[PDB]
Amino acid sequence: GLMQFTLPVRLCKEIELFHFDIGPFENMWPGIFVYMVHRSCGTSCFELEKLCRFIMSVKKNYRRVPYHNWKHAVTVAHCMYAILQNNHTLFTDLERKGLLIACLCHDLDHRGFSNSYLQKFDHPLAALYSTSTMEQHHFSQTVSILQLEGHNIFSTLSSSEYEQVLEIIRKAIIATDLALYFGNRKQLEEMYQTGSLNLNNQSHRDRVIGLMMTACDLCSVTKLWPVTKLTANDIYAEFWAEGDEMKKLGIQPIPMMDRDKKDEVPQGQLGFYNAVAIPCYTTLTQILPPTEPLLKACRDNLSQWEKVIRGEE
Ligand SMILES: O=C(Nc1cnccc1C(=O)N1CCCC1)c1nc(C2CC2)ccc1Nc1cncnc1
Numbered sequence: 001g002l003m004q005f006t007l008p009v010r011l012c013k014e015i016e017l018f019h020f021d022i023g024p025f026e027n028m029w030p031g032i033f034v035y036m037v038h039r040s041c042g043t044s045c046f047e048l049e050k051l052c053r054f055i056m057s058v059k060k061n062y063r064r065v066p067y068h069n070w071k072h073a074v075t076v077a078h079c080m081y082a083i084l085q086n087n088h089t090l091f092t093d094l095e096r097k098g099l100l101i102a103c104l105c106h107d108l109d110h111r112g113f114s115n116s117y118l119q120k121f122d123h124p125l126a127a128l129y130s131t132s133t134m135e136q137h138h139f140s141q142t143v144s145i146l147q148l149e150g151h152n153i154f155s156t157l158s159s160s161e162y163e164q165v166l167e168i169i170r171k172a173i174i175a176t177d178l179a180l181y182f183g184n185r186k187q188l189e190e191m192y193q194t195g196s197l198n199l200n201n202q203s204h205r206d207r208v209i210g211l212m213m214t215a216c217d218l219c220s221v222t223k224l225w226p227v228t229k230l231t232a233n234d235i236y237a238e239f240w241a242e243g244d245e246m247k248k249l250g251i252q253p254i255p256m257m258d259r260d261k262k263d264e265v266p267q268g269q270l271g272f273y274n275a276v277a278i279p280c281y282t283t284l285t286q287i288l289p290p291t292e293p294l295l296k297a298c299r300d301n302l303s304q305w306e307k308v309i310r311g312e313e
């Protein structure tokens, strides 16, 4: 109970910053996450014995894929931890509990393939879940791990607190379906400009939390340039693997996914930062001013990709 986690000084300090990289030492990532839960939620809110067993079962059910892996889970959790700490009073004790857990579990058992690829392959998961295929599977896996003996970190919540937090986690994980992001941000944009945004409206919170999940999920675009550049390699390793599999099914893949069209990556990133990342963090900064560092960082990286095209690296 009096068992704080501490981090080495540089981590202790840098972990509060949005642009923090969790490092190449796998074995520290659980302590990092526990540290985040304790400082964000309390040393009280989860029985340590149970959290650790949950964290290690979640690690076990991420696969050894280049991008959608255990490292991504904790990177995404970290970003949500930074947002919650810089917007202390805007969130309930329960939202803080469920959101860090939602981020850790949001890509559980990802196989390194898009919802589209499942649909054209005709994967059983596409039979069982027609939209947000991987995302409904990710939530399904979360509930599975929560139902293993000695794994229910939510044991101490009232029945109604319990349905609230599992409903936050479910909406949170579904929101990470980037197909849903576009409309969800358009509505938040419209609601913020016309000033009808109201954080006591539950349907309004849901949208705001959805955008936070999109923000946290893309936070590799908000790191120092060298982290962003090297993460971009990982994401393209999966994209091209998927393109190979599309060709294997007799389907010309979109260029993003074609390893022959590697030349066109820097323009691809421009499109992405402009169509997705920049608008995402803009609307998020508008709703939550303290998140501006994510927007500043995203812009630097957009500018870094512009330098790539102009042959300046
Ligand atoms: O780069 C990404 N996507 C694209 C690249 N090239 C072309 C088109 C796209 C694209 O998805 N769209 C949709 C509509 C706009 C174009 C990208 N995608 C995603 C998910 C959407 C899967 C996550 C991160 C990403 N980048 C990235 C991540 N971490 C470090 N550095 C860079």
Ligand SMILES: [Mg+2]
Pocket: 106, 107, 134, 176
């Ligand atoms: Mg995902």
Ligand SMILES: [Zn+2]
Pocket: 072, 076, 106, 107, 176, 217
């Ligand atoms: Zn993700």
